[PDB]
C-alpha cells in the first residue's frame, strides 16, 4: 500500500494532544443547543468582576467581619487605617476575590488591577481618608505624609461614598505593590450617629490583565471525599 514510516511518538498518549477520536454513538443527535443567558467564554471576564477583598484577614476576625475595613473616630490623625499588598495570586486579602482565585489556576499573570473602596457609614458621617498606592520594590509608607508624596487619593467619603484606585501593573510570575489607607482627617459625625464605620474593598482586574500556563490550584486538597 501507500508507503509510510512510523516516527517517534507513535502509540504515545499525551493527555494534552487535541486528537480525533471516533464517536461511540454515531448518528446520535445530542439535545439541540438553545440559548441560555449568562454564557462566559473567558476567565478574564470573571477576573474583571469586582469581588470583595478580605482585607480584615486578621486573627480572631471571623465570618463577614473579615470583609470590612473598620473605620472609627481616631484619637490620633494620620494613623494607618489598613494596608494590603496588591498580589491576587498570593495568600492574603486577595484570596477572597474572583481574580485572586483564578490567578491560583495559572502560573503567570500581568496587567492592571482596580480596587474600589465603599464607605458604609451613615449619611451624616464625613471625613477624609488617604488611599495611597506604593509601587513594587518600595516598603509601605510609615507616615501619612510619605504616602501623600506618592501616588494617592484624598478620598472625602462625606462627598462620594465610593472611590476607585487603579493599580497600574502587578506582574506576579511563578516584590509587589502595597495599598495603604490613612486617616487624612478625623471621623466627623453629628450627634446621635455611629462614630465607627466600615470600608468595603473590592478588587478586580482590568481589561489588559492576562493569564498564562494553566496550573492546578492548591486552594483545594483531595482527601477521603
Amino acid at each position: 500500500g501507500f508507503p509510510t514510516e512510523l516516527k517517534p511518538g507513535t502509540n504515545q498518549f499525551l493527555t494534552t494532544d487535541d486528537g480525533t477520536s471516533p464517536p461511540i454513538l454515531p448518528g446520535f443527535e445530542p439535545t439541540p443547543l438553545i440559548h441560555i443567558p449568562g454564557e462566559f467564554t473567558s476567565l478574564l471576564d470573571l477576573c474583571q468582576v469586582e469581588t470583595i477583598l478580605e482585607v480584615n484577614n486578621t486573627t480572631g476576625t471571623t465570618g463577614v467581619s473579615r470583609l470590612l475595613i473598620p473605620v472609627r473616630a481616631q484619637n490620633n490623625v494620620d494613623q494607618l487605617c489598613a494596608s494590603f499588598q496588591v498580589d491576587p495570586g498570593r495568600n492574603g486579602p486577595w484570596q477572597s476575590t474572583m481574580v485572586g482565585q483564578i490567578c491560583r489556576y495559572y502560573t503567570q499573570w500581568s496587567g492592571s488591577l482596580k480596587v474600589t473602596f465603599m464607605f458604609t457609614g451613615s449619611f451624616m458621617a464625613t471625613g477624609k481618608m488617604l488611599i495611597a498606592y506604593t509601587p513594587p520594590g518600595s516598603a509601605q509608607p510609615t507616615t501619612r505624609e510619605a504616602a501623600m508624596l506618592g501616588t494617592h487619593i484624598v478620598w472625602d467619603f462625606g462627598l462620594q461614598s465610593s472611590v476607585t484606585l487603579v493599580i497600574p501593573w502587578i506582574s506576579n510570575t511563578h516584590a509587589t505593590g502595597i495599598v495603604t489607607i490613612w486617616y487624612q482627617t478625623n471621623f466627623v459625625v453629628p450627634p446621635d450617629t455611629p462614630t465607627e464605620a466600615n470600608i468595603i474593598a473590592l478588587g478586580a482586574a482590568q481589561k489588559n490583565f492576562t493569564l498564562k500556563l494553566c496550573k492546578d490550584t492548591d486552594e483545594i486538597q483531595q482527601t477521603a471525599e
Binding site: L33, E39, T59, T62, S96, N208, T210
Partner: protein, 229 residues
Amino acid sequence: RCVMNRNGVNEASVEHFYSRAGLVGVVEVKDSGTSLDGYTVWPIDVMGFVQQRRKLELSTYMRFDAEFTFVSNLNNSTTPGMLLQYMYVPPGAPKPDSRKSYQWQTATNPSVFAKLSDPPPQVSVPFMSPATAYQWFYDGYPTFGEHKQATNLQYGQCPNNMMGHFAIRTVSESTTGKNIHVRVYMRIKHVRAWVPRPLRSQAYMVKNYPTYSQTITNTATDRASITTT
C-alpha cells in the same frame, strides 16, 4: 522580576481552561484473590476528584463532548496481550452484573475491543443530556410531590447529568488471576459554560452535595494585624 508585556488572551478562554484530558477515574478489573469478578463498571463521573469538581463548579451549566482514553495495565505495569472489552453503557441501559452477563453482547452498547498491548483505546462520548447543558447545580428536586422526607436526600441531584457507564472486562472464559488497573482519562471538548459561580472555598465533605463542615475555614489566610504586610 516584572513582565511589562501582556500574555495571550487565549490561555484564559473557557475552552482552554477545561482542556488537557485528565484522570477522572481509576478502576481495577479484579480477577484474582477473593474477588474473581473479571469485570468492573465505572459510572462516568466528571467530578470524581475535588480538583476537577471545583474547576467544573466554576460554571453552572456546561455542554461538552468528552474524549475518553483508557490507560490499562497490570499491577507490575506490564501490558501483555490480554484482550479487554470497554463497553460504553449509555444512560438508561442496564449494566452488566457478571463476567459473562448477557449485557456484554447488547449491540446498542458501544463496545471497544482492545488488548493491553495496544495503544490506549480512545473514544468520543457526545453530549448525553436530555437538557441543553449539564447542571453542576440543580436547586430543586427531581421527584414529583411534596419533599418533607426526613433525610432530605435527592435534593440538588440533577438526573440529566448521567453520561453512562464504562463496563470493562477481560474477554476470558474463566478467571485469569490477574488484576488490571484502568486509568480513565477524559478530555472536555467544545465546552460551553454558563452562569459563572464563586469557586468553592470550603472543603468538599461528600460527593453530589455541597455540604460543608461546621468549622468554616476563612477564604483568606490570617494576618497579624490589618496594617501588617
